[PDB]
Design a protein that fits this description.
This is part of a larger assembly, with 1 copy of chain A (430 residues), 2 copies of chain B (125 residues), 2 copies of chain C (352 residues) and 2 copies of chain D (55 residues).
Chain B: H1 3-15, H2 17-34, H3 43-46, H4 52-60, H5 63-81, H6 102-120
Helix pairs in contact in B: 4-6
Chain C: E1 2-4, E2 12-15, E3 17-19, H1 31-38, H2 48-58, E4 60-62, E5 65-66, E6 71-72, E7 75-78, H3 82-95, H4 100-118, H5 126-134, H6 153-163, E8 169-172, H7 178-185, H8 189-192, E9 212-216, E10 221-228, H9 234-244, E11 257-263, E12 266-275, H10 278-293, H11 308-311, E13 336-341
Parallel strand pairs in C: 1-8, 9-13
Antiparallel strand pairs in C: 2-7, 3-8, 4-7, 5-6, 10-12, 10-13, 11-12
Chain D: H1 3-6, H2 8-18, H3 32-51
Classes of the chains: A alpha+beta (430), B mainly alpha (125), C alpha+beta (352), D mainly alpha (55).
Residues 30, 32-34, 36-37, 40 of chain F line the site of one heme C.
Chain lengths: 430, 125, 352, 55, 352, 55, 125
């Protein structure tokens, strides 16, 4: 199992499991959710300078690999290396987060980096519809609230950003109190904690970041109708459960019940999902996936989907929502059992991956909120505990007759009004 | 009624030499009395097809048996609408009166039976 | 009949059955494809449906991947239920029903999809055209089915008879108890299986250099080159690829992708220059070929090209090595060139 | 396309009395339906006309 | 502005306006196709409809046909109505309106049709490849529009300007009073046309040999070869063609087509072997190439090969000849090969 | 496909009173239509009931 | 009434200095009183499209103009259903109220008129 965490002057957390490489990186407890409408896309802008060609060559010669990640709740800068070169990493991490906090931001590099993410983001809004719709789902579900800020940042606030903004953010967020350095792969705990404690100092210690206003959900919808697109992508959700919630898993199990489906992959159509009977007769969609996005303040439970059957979208939604109704009144026992097995399975492949850069992002995010990583074995214990009765209570609070967030793009003329869809959140009774 | 059911009962009879020697004759006579062979039709052409199972079957049927069946059916309608019977030599000779669609039907039936069972399988911890 | 393992205190295990039946050894154009798509369908003792309903309740999934050299039958599951997934993979190899309707209703469709997707990505239309012209008829076999030459149900079956044999497949347990796997395999239908001859040759097969092919295409235009490697000269081409796929190269921004495909009898190196307008493609390729001809390296890629090749290597095979720290010098002899897209405003091999 | 086919009203007629696909082999027993239709008319008409004198 | 003619005591007359705007001179991939399909649309003074309606009442029709080198505007009518067709044809070259909608509602459709029809006959895909690999960008240009590179409504108008000029065109009235044709060609809008430089070079446009392309196509498999000629060598390649399509050649039944495409500066000799199964296609070309490698002739074809080139002469052009009752021996140097169809079951250039 | 849509009788009811696409901006003058429908019913129902007593 | 006829009569009033001065002022006034401008619509949007000529024109109307028209109309309904007008700075301005669809119509009518003539041309020998 493992997972060990110790303080010092800063807080360190590691997880070693003798495999191939080993990665070390600094994960900051602030991210997209800590930005503003006008400075939005600043973190995604740091991510690209840290991954700049200038800095990439410096670590490439030294035999390292750089990996950055920008999320809502957090931010991460990770360096991969061989098991032995575990010290080569820290000397680069520190070089770029202390020495080169004056370099890099030098023009000719910033302008190059900015022109590149400005295109990178313009490509995303023109092509990656599924993820764009999801981004807009957050945008409307949590509108005028922290969580509503898109990770890559807007295309406008991006071209208004100058070095100063980058610096201001770093000075306000990249701090000792709001940070966690992590190490996964095969590097031992005592090896890191000491190598870090070698070079003392603090660098803005005792400084706390500017707080804000708790994120909130709002029943709303955003429809980006584009008739020139060949499909209709849509995502829909309700207020979910935040990480470190009594129902963190109960909610995650409910999503696994309806799961994911790809109409073109033979095995997918054979799944044990009652909904798949209703959707395959007239092929209501090409694919769909259910999720249970959790964050520090709130979350989103619902599903995403793409469809070519533009004249029958109303049924896609109808059947899909009639199934969600079941979780409050008729979810069977074997539906819950199947979910557990498949939850455990997909949950395991998530934690137990052959890439430490994944493991890092998972260790950091957790210890950066609850201050400790929940062992995979401990999870299974909770998952197997969950009863049919549990799923129904959760559904009664979260799902039954509750507001919803809708977002769509492409040929969505057939997606009926908010009130029509909202109505399906329940069923008639005597 | 299912063919899985018909084929169950039927075979049991067809196996025990007591029921066999007693029924097969009645059955052969019942069939020659039915008169369908006289319209150039095989029994399987008579199976009502307005259901998922039969529809599944007919599609799975090899091209040639299908076109043939097509002809037989049309021929039957033309003859019936003329109120005659086909010239005696064109009658389906009992040896031709084969259950050609049947295997497909039974396959489809049991396939459905399973799907049905696996949809309601209980769990025991 | 090889059998490996690893074992760890993990919760997730993953059985694998690498069978040398990739496009490499396909008797007709696409049989490898169809057979792969045919796996996990009905077997005389298990319906495609039950396999799935069961494994879902058991916690575990099945997958079938097609390589240019393999037909991998991976199965991700919970560590303990090991015996099931062994018999499972067995039943598929020894008794897959191969019913005529499963072909028309499931295999053909899915295979058609795989090809429909691949047909729109000009780099995989370039990379396919490459193997076609370099290795000609060996690995030169098209990866996917497109029905240019008909493949009947029998063919998919005759071919399944050839490839699914003891002396042609290797069981590869990952995160499995060595003792128990070997134990379970030998009481499964993997031992009852016919043991025909292995279809792997240890020798380098025909290279053919200086070959060119142009493909008219609507969408993104792509210019690309391929280079066959030697059973040893490959270790350097791995750093060549990584050098160009890093900030160390003064031209890693002029290419879309750069890699070296490794095989037990050689390998192929490919570099692609993909872009919207034919001009940028023309510039960036005309440059790479002229810029590399005037060779370079010095190995700053070493110690890095052996980091990217450290994570990638987790699948029971860590050869190469040694030749690095050793060989560190490159130029550019002869190569193969395929231009896809706006062929008219894209260069030929004449210039470059 | 023909008028009887395109018109809102006439088309209902066309698809029930004119182009309606019948099995070539239906016999005279299938004629009972139209007869019941006629009875309804006769009954209805003769009736309304008598109502004009009934108490 | 060359004005030819003939005249005769007949009733039908056919007025043709040859303009060197064929696929060779094409500025963008297919503009020639589009401009040809654009001809006879709306003019600033006569809608397409009125031109037809009116012409019908007179007893005449129009047609715009695309060559690999010309864009011929033929107009068959009833002799006495000569003037109408002159001013009519003129009117087209000078003032076609090129409305944005005529392109979308008429031209592009008609073009995509033309291409899809062609796209299904492999002898024509083999022939398109033949020209493409022999004469790269000159005659190697795609004959029809396939949108590989976008051609705007402007590009058509530009190429229309380059091509529709006095120096670049030749009027040719078959069965027409020459005296009246010139009088009418003058005083018409033809003369008021610009006089941009003609686009014909007498020099041989590069050749390229030993080139081969392989195209995967579903259906009929076809193997073919093309050999570029000179301004004088084309004399023998013409007879070779008729010889290979006559009862005089033992192997005439082993090929489908054999012909020589003449030009004012060269030519391409094409030989196509089309069948069904790749086995009979291979055998039939492996022999054709084998036996022609063992040069043979004696030319018993002469005085027949000039009987076939006698009926095929009425389109106001008659070069060669003379080298008939002259050269009578043929070997087989180098050529270009294309294999369309069942690719993995057809010979390469290596063999043959 | 939903039932209200698939049934021979409910699909009619469905495409006329449930799924029928209306212009978002129609005002209350568009309410006169249904009012007339109601009127026809009031007249018919009241009439038949009164008819049981009329001579 | 045809636009061919409207423009025939309109241009004539416009082209004469006497009639021009006496009508146009009344015209601009009549237009302000109509009020479609306060609902964010150009008069051409108001033209009824349920007829072939208008369909032909709208089909022929370039993208930019179509998507905009689409917005204008959707916007108008939304405003109309709320029983408000748009904020004055959103009102379609005088030099914006341009007859964009008009030429496509005039051309479509022209084409139609001709076809009709050519479909009935009498011949005289
Ligand atoms: C038999 C069914 C019946 C139907 C159906 C019917 N009515 Fe009547 N109606 C009567 C009877 C009975 C009377 C006489 C009693 C009365 O005056 O209400 C009557 C009387 C009337 C009167 C006289 C007003 C008065 O002094 O009461 C009017 C007007 C009238 N009907 C209008 C209508 C209209 C309009 C409809 C249909 C839209 C209609 N009726 C349908 C039965 C019917
Ligand atoms: C003289 C004409 C006329 C008469 C009388 C008339 N209608 Fe209509 N009706 C119309 C027209 C025209 C429309 C379409 C108006 C629109 O929606 O723009 C219409 C529309 C309707 C509508 C849709 C709702 C609405 O008001 O737009 C209904 C329902 C309707 N009528 C019912 C009836 C019934 C029921 C009667 C009487 C028993 C009736 N109509 C009599 C002209 C009439």
């Amino acid at each position: 199992a493992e997972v060990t965490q110790l303080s010092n002057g800063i807080v360190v957390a590691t997880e070693h499991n003798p495999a191939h490489t080993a990665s070390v990186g600094v994960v900051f407890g602030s991210g997209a959710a800590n930005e503003n409408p006008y400075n939005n896309g600043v973190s995604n802008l740091w991510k690209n300078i840290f991954l700049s060609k200038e800095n990439s060559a410096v670590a490439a010669k030294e035999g390292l690999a750089l990996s950055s990640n920008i999320s809502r709740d957090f931010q991460s800068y990770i360096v991969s290396s061989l098991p032995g070169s575990t010290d080569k990493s820290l000397d680069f991490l520190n070089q770029s987060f202390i020495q080169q906090k004056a370099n890099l931001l030098s023009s000719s590099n910033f302008e190059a980096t900015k022109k590149s993410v400005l295109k990178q983001v313009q490509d995303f809004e023109d092509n990656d519809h599924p993820n764009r719709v999801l981004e807009h789902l957050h945008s409307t579900a949590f509108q005028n609230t922290p969580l509503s800020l898109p990770t890559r940042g807007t295309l406008e606030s991006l071209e208004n950003l100058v070095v100063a903004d980058l610096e201001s953010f770093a000075n306000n967020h990249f701090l000792n109190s709001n940070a966690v350095v992590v190490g996964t792969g095969n590097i031992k705990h005592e090896d890191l904690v000491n190598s870090i404690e070698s070079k003392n100092l603090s660098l803005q210690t005792g400084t706390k970041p500017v707080l804000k206003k708790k994120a909130a959900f709002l029943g709303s919808e955003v429809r980006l109708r584009d008739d020139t697109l060949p499909k209709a992508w849509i995502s829909l959700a309700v207020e979910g459960e935040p990480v470190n919630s009594p129902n963190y898993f109960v909610a995650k199990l409910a999503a696994q019940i309806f799961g994911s489906y790809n109409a073109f992959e033979p095995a997918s159509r054979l799944q044990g999902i009652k909904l798949l009977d209703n959707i395959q007769e007239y092929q209501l969609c090409d694919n769909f996936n259910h999720f249970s996005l959790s964050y520090k303040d709130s979350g989103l439970w619902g599903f995403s989907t793409a469809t070519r059957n533009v004249t029958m979208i109303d049924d896609l939604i109808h059947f899909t929502l009639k199934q969600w109704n079941r979780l409050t009144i008729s979810v069977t026992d074997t539906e819950v059992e199947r979910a557990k097995s498949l939850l455990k399975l997909q949950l395991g492949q998530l934690y137990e991956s052959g890439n430490p850069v994944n493991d890092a992002n998972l260790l950091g995010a957790e210890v950066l909120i609850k201050g400790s990583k929940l062992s995979l074995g401990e999870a299974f214990k909770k998952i197997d505990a969950i009863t049919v009765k549990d799923v129904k209570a959760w559904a009664g609070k979260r799902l039954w007759d509750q507001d919803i967030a809708i977002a769509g793009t492409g040929q969505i003329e057939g997606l009926l009004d908010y009130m029509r869809i909202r109505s399906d959140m329940s069923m008639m009774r005597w | 009624q299912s063919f899985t059911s018909i084929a169950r009962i039927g075979d049991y009879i067809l196996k025990s030499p007591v029921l066999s020697k007693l029924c097969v004759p009645v059955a052969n006579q019942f069939i020659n009395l039915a008169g369908y062979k006289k319209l150039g039709l095989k029994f399987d052409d008579l199976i009502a097809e307005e259901n998922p199972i039969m529809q599944t079957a007919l599609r799975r049927l090899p091209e040639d048996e299908s076109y043939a069946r097509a002809y037989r059916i049309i021929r039957a309608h033309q003859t019936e609408l003329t109120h005659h019977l086909l010239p005696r030599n064109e009658w389906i000779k009992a040896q031709e009166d084969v259950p050609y669609l049947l295997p497909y039907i039974l396959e489809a039936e049991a396939a459905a039976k399973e799907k049905d069972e696996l949809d309601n399988i209980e769990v025991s911890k | 009949l090889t059998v490996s393992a690893r074992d760890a205190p993990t919760k997730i295990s993953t059985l694998a059955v690498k069978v040398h039946g990739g496009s490499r050894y396909a008797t007709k154009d696409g049989v490898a494809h169809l057979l792969n798509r045919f796996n996990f369908q009905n077997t005389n003792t298990r319906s495609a449906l039950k396999l799935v309903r069961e494994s879902e309740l058991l916690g575990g999934t099945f997958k079938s991947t097609l390589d240019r050299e393999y037909i991998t039958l991976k199965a991700t599951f919970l560590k303990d239920d090991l015996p099931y997934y062994v018999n499972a993979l067995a039943d598929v190899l020894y008794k897959t029903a191969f019913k005529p309707h499963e072909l028309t209703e499931s295999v053909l469709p899915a295979a058609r999809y795989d090809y429909a997707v691949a047909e729109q990505c000009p780099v995989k239309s370039a990379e396919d055209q490459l193997y076609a012209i370099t290795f000609r008829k060996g690995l030169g076999n098209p990866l996917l089915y497109d029905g240019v030459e008909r493949v009947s149900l029998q063919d998919i079956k005759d071919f399944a008879d050839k490839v699914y044999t003891k002396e042609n497949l290797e069981v590869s347990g990952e995160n499995v108890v060595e003792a128990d796997l070997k134990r379970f395999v030998d009481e499964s239908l993997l031992s009852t299986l016919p043991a025909g001859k292995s279809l792997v040759s240890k020798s380098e097969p025909k290279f053919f250099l200086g070959e060119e092919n142009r493909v008219r295409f609507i969408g993104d235009s792509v210019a690309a080159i391929g280079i066959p490697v030697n059973k040893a000269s490959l270790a350097q081409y791995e750093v060549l690829a990584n050098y160009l796929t890093s900030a160390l190269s003064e031209l890693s921004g002029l290419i879309s992708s750069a890699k070296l495909d490794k095989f037990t009898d050689g390998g192929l190196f490919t570099l692609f220059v993909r872009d919207q307008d034919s001009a940028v493609v023309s510039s960036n390729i005309k440059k790479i070929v002229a810029d590399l001809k005037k060779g370079k390296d010095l190995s700053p890629a070493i110690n890095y090209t052996k980091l990217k090749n450290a994570v990638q290597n987790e699948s029971v095979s860590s050869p190469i090595e040694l030749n690095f720290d050793a060989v560190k010098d490159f130029k550019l002899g002869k190569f193969n060139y395929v231009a896809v897209g706006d062929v008219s405003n894209l260069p030929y091999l004449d210039e470059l | 396309m023909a008028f009887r086919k395109s018109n809102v009203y006439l088309s209902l007629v066309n698809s029930y009395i004119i182009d309606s696909p019948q099995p070539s082999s239906i016999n005279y027993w299938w004629n009972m339906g139209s007869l019941l239709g006629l009875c309804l008319v006769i009954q209805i008409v003769t009736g309304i006309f008598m109502a004009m004198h009934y108490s």
